[PDB]
Symmetry: C5
Subunit: 344 residues, 5 copies
C-alpha cells in the first residue's frame, strides 16, 4: 500500500467573517472514502477558536476529493471542528445545517450558488490602474481583451482545478466590475453545495497564490458605483419543481414576520454597504419579491413563471456569506412554510 498527502481544510472562529485554514497530513494506508480518514487536531489559540488557554480543537473529516494541484493520489479533506469532547465547536456552522437537512429531506431541497469575487494585487484592485480608476463599467462584464479582462489565467486554472476535484461547477463568467468574476456551484443538496463551495473557495485563494494575486469575497471592495460581490442563491424543493403554488409560498415565507431581518443579519458582514436601493439589489432593510425583477430581494425567473414550476433566486446574500448559514436559513424558513401549507 501507498503513501499520500492529505490536505485537511477547516473554518476558524474569526469575526465578523470566518477564514479557511489548512494543513498537510502524510498518510500511509490503503485508500478508502472518508470513513478511513483519521480525526486530527490543531491549536485553537492561533485561529480565534480559543485565543485563550483552554481550547484545543479536533478536526473531523466530512468531505473529501482529489487534490488537483498536487495531483496523483493526493486528496483534499474538508473537516468540521469539534471540541475535545467531540461535540461541535461553537464556530461550527455545519452541524446545525446537517440537522435541518435531515429534518426536511422529504422535500428534497436543492441549491445553486453563484459565487462572486474580486481580484487584487496588494491593496490595488487587479483591474484598476495604480493610483487611479479604470473606465466606467459596461465593457468588463462577459468581456474579452486585455483592456477589459483581468485574471483570466487564474480563473481558468481555478475552473480546471474545481472540475478535476469533481466539484459541480455549472459555469463561470466575468462580472460587471473589472477584475470581478463569478462561478456557479450546483445544483446540489444543502450539505453538499455548502461543502463544495468552501472547498472551491479554498481552491481559488490557493490557485491564485501561484499567480501572485489575491481574491476577496468582500461585498463592496471599492466604494461608489463600482459593483458589489454577491452570492446569489437558487433554491427549490420537489414541490417547487412540480408546481407554482409552492414557489409563491416560499417567496412569501421570506417576507413573513422577522424573517427578512433574520436572513439579512446573517447574510454576510458589510451587507449595508452592498445592498443599497440605487443599484443591485434592493435595500437590505426592505423585503420584496417579483417576476423578472432584478431590483427585488428575491427574483422569480421568467422561465419559472412560464413553466408554472422551477426555483427561486435569493439575491440578498453577500459574496462573504457562510454557505452553511444561508442554506440552513432558507431550508428552515421555506421548507417549514411549505410543510404548514401542505405543499410538500
Amino acid at each position: 500500500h501507498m503513501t499520500f498527502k492529505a490536505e485537511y481544510i477547516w473554518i476558524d472562529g474569526t469575526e465578523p467573517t470566518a477564514k479557511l485554514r489548512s494543513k498537510t497530513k502524510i498518510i500511509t494506508a490503503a485508500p478508502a472514502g472518508l470513513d478511513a480518514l483519521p480525526v486530527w487536531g490543531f491549536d485553537g489559540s492561533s485561529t480565534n477558536q480559543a485565543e485563550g488557554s483552554s481550547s484545543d480543537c479536533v478536526l473531523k473529516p466530512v468531505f473529501s476529493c482529489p487534490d488537483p494541484i498536487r495531483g496523483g493520489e493526493d486528496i483534499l479533506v474538508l473537516c468540521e471542528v469539534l471540541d475535545t469532547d467531540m461535540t461541535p465547536h461553537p464556530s461550527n456552522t455545519r452541524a446545525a445545517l446537517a440537522e435541518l437537512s435531515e429534518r426536511f429531506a422529504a422535500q428534497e431541497p436543492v441549491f445553486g450558488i453563484e459565487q462572486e469575487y474580486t481580484f487584487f494585487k496588494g491593496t490595488r484592485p487587479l483591474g484598476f490602474p495604480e493610483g487611479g480608476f479604470p473606465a466606467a463599467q459596461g465593457g468588463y462584464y462577459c468581456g474579452v481583451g486585455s483592456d477589459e479582462i483581468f485574471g483570466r489565467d487564474v480563473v481558468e486554472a481555478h475552473l480546471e482545478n474545481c472540475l478535476k476535484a469533481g466539484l459541480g461547477i455549472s459555469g463561470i463568467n466575468a462580472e460587471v466590475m473589472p477584475g470581478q468574476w463569478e462561478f456557479q456551484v450546483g445544483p446540489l443538496a444543502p450539505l453538499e453545495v455548502s461543502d463544495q463551495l468552501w472547498v472551491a473557495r479554498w481552491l481559488l485563494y490557493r490557485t491564485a497564490e501561484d499567480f501572485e494575486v489575491s481574491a476577496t469575497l468582500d461585498p463592496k471592495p471599492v466604494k461608489g458605483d463600482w459593483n458589489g460581490a454577491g452570492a446569489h442563491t437558487n433554491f427549490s424543493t420537489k414541490a417547487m419543481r412540480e408546481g407554482y403554488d409552492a414557489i409563491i409560498t416560499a417567496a412569501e415565507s421570506l417576507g413573513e414576520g422577522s424573517k427578512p431581518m433574520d436572513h439579512v443579519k446573517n447574510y454576510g458582514a458589510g451587507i449595508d454597504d452592498r445592498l443599497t436601493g440605487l443599484h443591485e439589489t434592493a435595500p437590505w432593510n426592505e423585503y420584496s419579491y417579483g417576476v423578472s425583477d432584478r431590483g427585488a430581494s428575491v427574483r422569480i425567473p421568467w422561465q419559472v413563471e412560464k413553466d408554472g414550476k422551477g426555483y427561486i433566486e435569493d439575491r440578498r446574500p453577500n459574496a462573504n456569506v457562510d454557505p452553511y448559514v444561508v442554506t440552513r436559513l432558507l431550508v428552515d424558513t421555506c421548507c417549514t412554510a411549505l410543510e404548514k401549507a401542505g405543499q410538500v
Copy 2:
C-alpha cells in the same frame, strides 16, 4: 461519460459599435451538433441590451467549433440574441442577413473578407516607441525583422487557433502600418463568412490577452498619414464568376440612388476618419468604381477584367464593420439589380 466546456459567444447592443460577449457553461451530455446544444440566457442591462430595468435575453446557438485554446473536447458556441418570445432581439443583425441569404440563394453569393487590425499596448500602438513615432511607412508591409515587425508571436498563435477551430482563413499578412495586421476569411456563403469572422475576432482578442497586448478594429488608430484599418470585401454570384456583364451591373448598382450613403453609413463607426480623398481609399462621400483602381470605392481586379469573369472588391468597409451588416447590404443591393437585369 463526459463533461466539457462550452463558451457561449454573442454580440451586444453597444453603440456606435457593438461588442463581443462570452461566458462558460459546463455541459454534461453526449455530443451532437448545435441542435443538441441548450439555449441559454443572460441579463441585458450589463450589455446595452437594456442598461435599464426590463431586459432578459435568450442565447440561441447558430454556429459551433472546437475551442483551440482550451483544447480537448471543449468548444466555442456562437449565438444569436433573442427576446424571451424567441423573436430576434433588436441588436440581432444576423436574422436580417439570414432572411436575405435565403431570398437570394439561387445566385449563390460568396464572400471573402480582408480583416485589418492594429496592436496596442495600453494607449500606445505596439509598433510605436513610448512618447514618439517610428520611421515613416514603407518597410512594415509584408515585412521581416524586429525593427519592422511587431506582434508576430500573437499573430501566429491566432492563426493556428483559427485553423484548429476549422475556420476558413485564406491568408495572413503584415500591413502598411507597424503593428498592423490582416487575415482573410473566405471564400464563403454570407452567414458562414460572417459567423466565422466574428469567432475569429473573438479569438484575436482572447489570444492577445495571454501576450498582454490589445487589438483594435478602430479605422484610424493613429491620426495623420498612418494607415487606416479596413475590412475590404470581395463579392460574387454564379453569374459574376461566369461572365463580365454581371460584374458591371454589380458595380453600377452600388452607385445608384441612395446606395452610396446607405452602405457607407453602415460600414462602420468613424468611416469619415478613414475614408479621406488623399490616401486609401476614396472619399466616403463619393462613389467610384474602376478596373485595378485602388483609389476607387470599388475595384475590379486586373485578373477579373482579363478573364471576363470573377468578383468585385468593396474597399469602403471599415475594420470595425459588422460582418452581418456589410454582407446583407451587398447581397441586397447587387443581387436585386442582377435579378432585374436577368443576370442570375
Copy 3:
C-alpha cells in the same frame, strides 16, 4: 558499466552552531546499500574541524537515499566524521548517540521532531515588507492566500523532495509568523530520526536555492512578539506507550538535579532569546511540566492523559538544535530514570 552521482553530506565543527557541508563524488560501481559506498575524506581547515595545519578528516557513510533533485540513480550519502585513526572526530555527535541507542535498545525509544524554519530574502524576512512590519499575527498560521502565505512553492518542492528521498515526514504546516513553516519528521528510532532530519534540512537549503530564497533555523529570527522557531520533540518508550506511570517518571526525570540546565545549554544557540517568560513557553531557566500546558517546559497532551499512555513533548529545543544531541540527552535522562523505576 554505469556511472552515478553521490552527494556526501556532513556536519562541521562550527561554533556555536554546526553547519552542513557537502560534495559530489562520481561513482562507477554496482549499486548496493550503504555498505558498498566508499569512505572518503576532506580538508578540515576549511570547515572549522581544524582551522590549523594538521587536520585531515575521513567521511564514513551512515545513511543513503535517492537524490530527489538530481533524480535518476543519483544518491545522497550522509556521513559521520572520523579522525585518520578511524576514531570519531571531536565534532562527531552521532557517536555519543549511537552508544546510548544501543545501551537502551530494549526500551525502544521513538522520536517525532517538529522542525520549524523561517524564509528570508537577503536580510529581509520573506513575509515582511521592505523597511517594515506586516499585519500582526493571526491569519498566517495554517493560512491560505497571497496576503498571508509566503514561500509555499519552496515548501511543496521541499516536501515532494523529502518523500521522493523516502524520508519519514508526517506533516507540514504554515506557522504563526509570516514566511514561517514547519515540517514534522517521525515517528522514528533515535539515530534514524536524527539522520533523516539532517538530510531534510540539507534538502530545505538546497531546494530553496532554486527559488533564490534562504531558510534559517535561527530560534528568534525577528525580535519582539514575532514567533520564535523551535524543534519540539516528542518522545516515548515501550513502557510509556503502555502506561501512564512511565510518563510521570519521564516528565519528573527532566526536572531532577542539573538535568534542566544540562539539556537547555545543549538545546541550541540563542535559546535565551526564544524561551522567555512572557509568551511561550516557560523561561529557559525554569523547568515545569503539565498536562495540556503550552507554557510548560514539557507538555503531556490531553489525549495521552486520557488514554493513560502515549508520549511526552519537550517544547524547549530551538529550531537550531542538533538532533543527535537532543535525542541522546532525552534517551539518556528519561530511559535511565525509567530503568531505575523498573518501568521499561
Copy 4:
C-alpha cells in the same frame, strides 16, 4: 484532405538595397512540388515596385522548402516577381542569372558564399555596452564565454532551422567583431545558392524576432577599426576544378577592362566604407589577385596552388550584396573569358 500554410517570400525594388517581403497563404490541396503551387500577387505601391498607378505584381514560385519554425507540413515558397504579362518585373534580378546559367551550363559553375552579419539591439550593437565600446578585437573571433560571445542562442536556432529547411550549410563561426557571425552556404549551382541564401537570410531575420534582436547585413555597422561584414564568394568551373591554367584565366578576367568597377558597383551598397586600403581587403578602387593574399581583391587559396586545381575566392562583395547579382557577374565575366581562352 489536408490544409497547410505557405509563406510566399520575395525581394522588393527598394534602393539602394532591396528587402525581403513575405506573406502567408493557407492552402487546402494535395502536396506536390512547386509547379502545383499557385501563382499569387501583391500590391507593388507599398514595396517600391510601383509607387505608382500601374503596377500589380505576380508572385511565381521558383523554390520551396519546409518551414522549420511552423513545422509539420508547412512550407516556405521563394518567388520571383513578374509583371501582369508574366514577364520579369524590373526588380527581378533572378531572370538575368537564369539566362546566363543556362548559357554557361557546360562549364558547371559552382558557388560558395560565406555570409557575414552583425547582431543589433535597437541602435546598439548587441556586443557593445550602452553608450560605449567593448574591448578591442581579438578574443571575439571563434570565441567562447559570456565576455566575448553574443547571440549564440539565435545563431544555433537559425542553423537548426536552415538544416531543417534542407539548406546547404557547411559551417558557422563567430566573427572578428563582437556580436558578428558568419554562415557558409554551398557549394552549389548559381540559381540554387542564390535562392537558398535568400531563404537563409529570411530565416535569420525571422529567427531573431523571437529573441527580440536584429541582424544587419550592413558592410560597416560600426565605423573605425571594428570589422566590416563581407560576403566572400567561392567560385569554380569543371576546368578550374581540373587545372591551374583556368584558375589564372579566371583570376585575370576580373582585372580586365571595366570589369573591376563593373563588379564593385554591384557588390553592395556602402562598399567604399568597408573596402579601404588599410584593412581587408584591398581598396574598392583597385583590382589585385594573389595566392593566399587576404589583402588581395581575389585570393587563390594555398591548397589550390599546391594541388594545381581548385577554386578562387572573391573577397570584395559586401554582406549586403544581392546573391543573384554577384553570381551573375562572376559567371558572366569568368565563364566568358574561359570560353575565349578555350579552357571549358
Copy 5:
C-alpha cells in the same frame, strides 16, 4: 544520408595565456570515430597564431566526443594546430607532450587534475555584492544555501554535460571563495587527461553562456585574503603506485637544479599573485615537499605514507595552467629521475 554537427575546438597563440577557439562544421558522411574526420583550417591572423602576414593554420583532430549541449549525434572535435606543411605549429604544446609520453610509456604515468574556477557577472565576482564585500570566508566551502552558494545551476549543467561527453570527472565541490568551484579530472594518461580537461574547460565557458555568467581561471581573481584558484596535479608512475622509495625520488627530483623555476615559470600567468608566502601554498620562489603539508610545494598525502605507496600532489600549478605543459614538465622531471634511479 544523414547530417551532423561537429564542433572543432583548438587552442590559440595568445600570450601570456592561450585561449580556446571553436567553429562549427556540417558533415555529411557515415559516422566513425576520429579517423574518418576531415582536417580543417583557419585564419591565424585573428588568433595570435600569426599576427603577421604568413600564417594559415591546419586543424588536425586529436580527440572527439559527443556534444552534450547539441545532443543527438553531434560531436566535439578537439584539434591540434599545424602549419601548412603539416608540421606542428609553434603554439602547439600537445606535440611535445606526445613525445615524452612515448619516451616514458614504460613507466605508465597517470594524472589527476583538480581544476578550480571563479564565477563572474561582468567585472563583479558572482558571490560579491555590488560595490562591497560579502562575509569573510568559512561558510562557502562545500556549502549549502542561497547566502553562501553561487552558480550551482551552472555547475550542475556543466557536470551533467561533462559526463554526457564521457569525460572522466571524479567529483565536484564548492570552494573557499564565494562563487569559486572545482572539478577533478582523472586519473588518466597525460594526453587523455589534458585533452579532456580542455574540452571540460570549453564546456564550462559554453554552458555558462546560457546562464549569462562568466567563468575565469585567473589565479587570484580578487586581491587580498580571498582564495586563489589553483590546478592541483596528482601524479604517479607504476613504480610510485608500487612503492614509497619511488615516491621520494619523484618529490626530490622537483627540488633539484633548475626544476623548481622551470616548472613555476610554466605553471601559469600570475603565479606570484596566488603563490605567496603567507597562505597557500609555498612561495612561488621556494620548493618544499612534505607529508600532509598543505604549505609545501608538493604534498604527500597521509594515506600514501601509511600505505607506503601512491601518488604525489603538486599544489603549485595555477588554475590557468596549460595541462599539456604541466603534464609534460612533470613527466620529464620525475620520470627521468626515476629511470636514473632504476625505479621504473
